[PDB]
Amino acid sequence: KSDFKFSNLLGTVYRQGNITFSDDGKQLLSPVGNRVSVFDLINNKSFTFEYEHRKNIAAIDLNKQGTLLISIDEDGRAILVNFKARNVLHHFNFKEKCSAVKFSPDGRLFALASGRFLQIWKTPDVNKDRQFAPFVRHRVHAGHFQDITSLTWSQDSRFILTTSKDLSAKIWSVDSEEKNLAATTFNGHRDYVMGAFFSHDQEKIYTVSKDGAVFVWEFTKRKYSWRITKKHFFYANQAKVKCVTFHPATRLLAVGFTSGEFRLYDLPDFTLIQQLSMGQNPVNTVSVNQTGEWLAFGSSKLGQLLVYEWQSESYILKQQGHFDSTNSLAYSPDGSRVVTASEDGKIKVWDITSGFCLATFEEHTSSVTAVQFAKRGQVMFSSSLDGTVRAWDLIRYRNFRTFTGTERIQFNCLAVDPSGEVVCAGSLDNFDIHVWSVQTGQLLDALSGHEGPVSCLSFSQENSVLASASWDKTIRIWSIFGRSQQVEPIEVYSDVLALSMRPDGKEVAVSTLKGQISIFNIEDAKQVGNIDCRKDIISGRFNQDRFTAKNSERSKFFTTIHYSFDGMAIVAGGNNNSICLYDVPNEVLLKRFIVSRNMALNGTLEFLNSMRPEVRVTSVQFSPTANAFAAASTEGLLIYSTNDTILFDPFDLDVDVTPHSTVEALREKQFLNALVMAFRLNEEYLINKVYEAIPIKEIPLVASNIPAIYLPRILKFIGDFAIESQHIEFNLIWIKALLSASGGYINEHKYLFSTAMRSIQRFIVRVAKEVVNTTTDNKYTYRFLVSTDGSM
Amino acid sequence: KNSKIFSPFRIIGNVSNGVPFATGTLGSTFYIVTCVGKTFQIYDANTLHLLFVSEKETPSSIVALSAHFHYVYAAYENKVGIYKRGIEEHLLELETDANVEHLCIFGDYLCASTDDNSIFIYKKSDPQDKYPSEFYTKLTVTEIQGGEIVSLQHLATYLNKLTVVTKSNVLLFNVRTGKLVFTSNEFPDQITTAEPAPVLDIIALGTVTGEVIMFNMRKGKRIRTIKIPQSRISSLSFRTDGSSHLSVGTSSGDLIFYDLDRRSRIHVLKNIHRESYGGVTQATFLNGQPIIVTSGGDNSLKEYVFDPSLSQGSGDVVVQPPRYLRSRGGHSQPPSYIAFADSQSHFMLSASKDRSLWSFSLRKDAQSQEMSQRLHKKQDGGRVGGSTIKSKFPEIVALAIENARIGEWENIITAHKDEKFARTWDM
Amino acid sequence: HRDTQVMRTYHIQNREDYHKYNRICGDIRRLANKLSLLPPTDPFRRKHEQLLLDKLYAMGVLTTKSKISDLENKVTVSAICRRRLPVIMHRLKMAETIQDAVKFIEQGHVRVGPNLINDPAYLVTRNMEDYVTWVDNSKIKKTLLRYRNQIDDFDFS
RNA sequence: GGAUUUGGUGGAUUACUAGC
């Protein structure tokens, strides 16, 4: 409940640096500005390493074995992370700017090129224990007029060739004895050489240039050495090759141009297979897999990563991250669906299960400020600064109606009636709460009475009451349904920019400008308590600042708050560097999360060493599944979670209860005990040992035997396990039994079980019904063929 | 006793212990090795970072150290390790049961001297080879020839001659033949420490009485002699900057500087290391540079420099007294109670029977500082009750620290041994 | 020296600030001109400058949104250089003079809503012109409240 | 013995693989 970890970063697929496929090619890794994200094409899952990188990734190195992954920052810091381990084995520091790092095919040593110097360093064994000084450098080459713009490695480690930007290209062997074989540097190349490629036969050397003219080097008699055999030229009106990737086995050449046109050629036949423009902006880094089936092209200017297969015209994954930042975060009733707003106004729907965007919405010309979902999967309402609010369908991907005001006002924020009849929005220009009906696109009423603008608006589902947020330091609770039209006002000490509505429908959580978060009642005007947030907020000193980070008033408030669906915890986040988790009854924070550690971003450091974009969280929500809360950052949408469960959180242990004892119960056939003895440890592998063990004939006997106290806990366990597990039929008999054993109790404690009901009924909708409908549709088609008369 | 979970990383909080540190030079940089018990360390001399600690603990204490350019020669009980980057790359075992007291390197040869007056010679097997490996021969010294071996020195420009200094007199052994080419005359005092000179044919000598004796080998005579009141000379070094300077390090904590040209002392340093733990065990002017490096046995290592002279025309007469430069510290006595400071494992509080708490650094080993003990002047206005000769706080047996509100008020509570109160500390 | 002559009247950081506005204030007229060369009964053109006068009045560089002639004649740099923040603090009578308002912004006494503002050259929208106040608990908002004998240190004003 | 103010150096202020 308390220990969250950084599970996933979502959005911003590609920021900068090399994009390199894995040796297997199952997983493709794209480097973000401060972190490295690994995408598995086969499992459609995105995983991001918990480690921060202190500036933006400039180079990515992947070992052929895959044991060690190296990322080089602009500063030259080197971070080594084992893919299986997912931990930083060593953090050596390079002292100059790194362009590309490529491990050798053997993997004994990794070639590294910095400036005009080429370095080969023996790689420390992953299996070997950590050492104080693991990094060792085998050799340094300084014979370059200018720093090499690219590095290429042959199958053997004897020859390493780096193409300089001067025009000249040089070849370096690994071992000193093979120096006599190859030490020559090519000359006469026009413009600059983007990269140098080696074919399976070492006789032919392929070079590329900025101009776009390609020259092939073939060794032959004029006692005779290294003529140009044939030249190959690519014709582009204004396009110039930027990044070139070549695969020797398939003889496939990937060319990157300033125009952004994508073209493919074969070195042996010099034939152009296809020319496609990924985007107007030029491709920065292109990489190829061993098979060569998947090619990844990423443009830094548009910040979009695209993967294409040459053999079949289908794209495994194509997506573009938000250009600036996500203004609002919207969570649908189903845990998987995620909606993120952007400054551009483009709306993209992310997926909780796999970090990809199902679709985009370009309906809002102006930037989108708030995106919210009504209590259905039918539609989502988005608030924009354009002055119009447009509802969207998710079955059909279309506007219903675009709600607008009278005198064309900006709209910050938004509130949707849970029974989806009424959409309310609020401004900075007007400070009148406009109210639209969902059916008739007219505005029903202009609810007014605030001095100063409305910051936020929310509706409690249980009581259907909307509470306004004002800069006048007074919180007014509206009651708008059914012949009442009565507004209750509660005074607040400082401008309230944060409004949170509890699931209960009885409490309202606020975030004022003094820092302090207050929790009010609704049926009474009084407050339960307030929790003090000015001290435990980390604030950055910007680069252009003139004050200490201690006494600036930039970031010590909270520009968002969201209650957990338990109603017991608040996650807050503002224009600061930090996110919080306050407990609501005990009134004490639980754990404080630093969003990012980048010198590249501004608001990170409390103390600088002796404009840049500010780093701040915009909108935070806790998911219905409730494992993690997503906070929408500058770097992109973060996701925190507890899906690890590497943690010993026991409950009611006796001395008699050990993991072995639970296993003994299965032999004893005491299913009721061995489940409770496994719930006492609260460890998932003992539970899966006893959940998968007990048979069908004693599931309901066990369900009746299960205590009321463990009913909420057992339901949550089934919800997280059955989504990725092959047993449909065995899991549903449990959910039949838990519901069948105590239908009334679960219904009576509707507030007590919220996360369990939502998690269980995502498993039923997403994977269980689609198996049903395919079984249903297939059966009807067979019935139609036999029933219908034969043709001719 | 091999564990399955844990494996030792390095020992932290220890700089020196009393074994004489030995300097080495790589490229233009200067690297200084010390030892800690059974595991030696390597410090840079330009900023005193920690560069290398050894990969395994030695089976016993390192008795003597020396370092030729890349290779650190470490000598524990029966064996001599020839270490590069803290990695044991060649273990050289001496064929006695005696324990090795002193060690020396020149040329193709290694020269190790056990305690029972026996000197072992190890040759480079090839001139291509970097570490000497093959056992050449066994040189002995009977007690009619000289006393117990004080040290082994190899002077400049002597083909295979090894200046063996003893408690009685000074020897010379041509290690190619194995023969005593020259023996000196017997000295009236017990010799404690010898060191060569940047001049030709001269080794410097140090007695248990306070006498430094310059001794020529070509003439076999005493050229100069320097008397010191009431001191046991423990370390000698010459400044090679171009200005003649001798540094005599006592065992009563004093470091004493001479000017051999002017025949005068210049400035005497008092208590730069503790008298009780051994005084100045080793002091060395770095080559051609005005930096002397002092390392006592009281778990510290300090550098002192000479500023340039304030006189324009005079120069060598008006000499600036030496000046404190960077240093590293540790813990004199063993630590009683420690704790970790923060979540990223970046500081460790350590309070010991030395009565002085230390905030050591796991991260960078030059970042460790003693927490000050300097009482805040009271809010109330009445004066603080305490002895005017300030003594340290009694030793700390219970510590508590919660890091949540740091930098705004106190967050460390320590309970001292046998005190009815218990103080607080800001982190 | 028109660029200097209006840098003094409004107090500008760099003498290049003027021609940093006068490139924009010229770019208004170049879009005004080509939108005058479209035929008059064009539902693009009729939509498109009224789309623009919405923005140039919200930002407040021009006094009215009715007169279409203002868009070439009244769009001056000294018009856009008096929706600067220190001019607005002198218009709203916050500081006494216009140099003294730059002195209070740079020292950090003024704010817009939540966050204090520190660049002197902050353009302020006519809509956002409502929300400039002295930053709270400041030593210059404390002195004001002492003049009316109306401090309240529970606010720690 | 006590208090206030100030000049200068050294060590930190990112995570320790030696100089040309």
Curated annotation (Swiss-Prot), chain A:
A Pfam family this protein belongs to? Utp12
Describe where the WD repeats fall, as residue ranges on this chain. 11-51, 52-92, 93-131, 143-182, 188-222, 236-275, 278-318, 321-360, 363-402, 406-448, 449-488, 491-530, 553-592, 612-650
**Which subcellular locations apply to this protein?**
Nucleus, Nucleolus
Q: Tell me which UniProt keywords the record has, alphabetically.
A: Nucleus, Phosphoprotein, Repeat, Ribonucleoprotein, Ribosome biogenesis, rRNA processing, WD repeat
Report the superkingdom from the record. Answer: Eukaryota
Q: What's the chief localization of this chain?
A: nucleus
- Put simply, this protein is called Periodic tryptophan protein 2
Curated annotation (Swiss-Prot), chain B:
Q: What superkingdom heads the lineage? A: Eukaryota
- Where is it localised? Nucleus, Nucleolus
User: Where are WD repeat segments found?
Assistant: 22-53, 63-93, 101-140, 150-183, 190-227, 234-269, 277-329, 336-370, 397-427
Q: Which residues form a coiled coil?
A: none
The record's comment about this protein's domains reads: The WD repeats are grouped into two tandem seven-bladed beta-propeller regions.
Q: How does it assemble?
A: Interacts with snoRNA U3. Interacts with MPP10. Interacts (via WD repeats) with UTP18. Component of the ribosomal small subunit (SSU) processome composed of at least 40 protein subunits and snoRNA U3.
Misc remark for this entry?
Present with 2020 molecules/cell in log phase SD medium.
- What is its biological role? Involved in nucleolar processing of pre-18S ribosomal RNA and ribosome assembly.
What is the name attached to this protein's record?
U3 small nucleolar RNA-associated protein 21
Please tell me the species this chain comes from: Saccharomyces cerevisiae (strain ATCC 204508 / S288c) (Baker's yeast)
Curated annotation (Swiss-Prot), chain C:
> What is any one of the record's Gene Ontology cellular component terms?
90S preribosome
What are the recorded GO MF terms, alphabetically? RNA folding chaperone; rRNA binding; snoRNA binding
Q: Which PROSITE patterns match?
A: S4
Q: Which UniProt keywords apply?
A: Nucleus, Ribonucleoprotein, Ribosome biogenesis, RNA-binding, rRNA processing, rRNA-binding
The cross-references to Pfam families, in alphabetical order and at most eight, read: Ribosomal_S4, S4
Q: Which GO terms describe its biological process?
A: maturation of SSU-rRNA; ribosomal small subunit biogenesis; rRNA processing
Signal peptide feature range = none
Q: What positions does the domain S4 RNA-binding occupy?
A: 83-149
Superkingdom, taxonomy of origin: Eukaryota
Gene3D superfamilies, sorted: RNA-binding S4 domain
Annotated compartments: Nucleus, Nucleolus
Q: Which family does it belong to?
A: Belongs to the universal ribosomal protein uS4 family.
Q: Could you describe the subunit structure of this protein? A: Component of a heterotrimeric complex containing IMP3, IMP4 and MPP10. Interacts with MPP10. Component of the ribosomal small subunit (SSU) processome composed of at least 40 protein subunits and snoRNA U3.
Q: What does this protein do?
A: Required for the early cleavages at sites A0, A1 and A2 during 18S ribosomal pre-RNA processing.
User: What is the name of the protein in this document?
Assistant: U3 small nucleolar ribonucleoprotein protein IMP3
Its source organism is Saccharomyces cerevisiae (strain ATCC 204508 / S288c) (Baker's yeast)
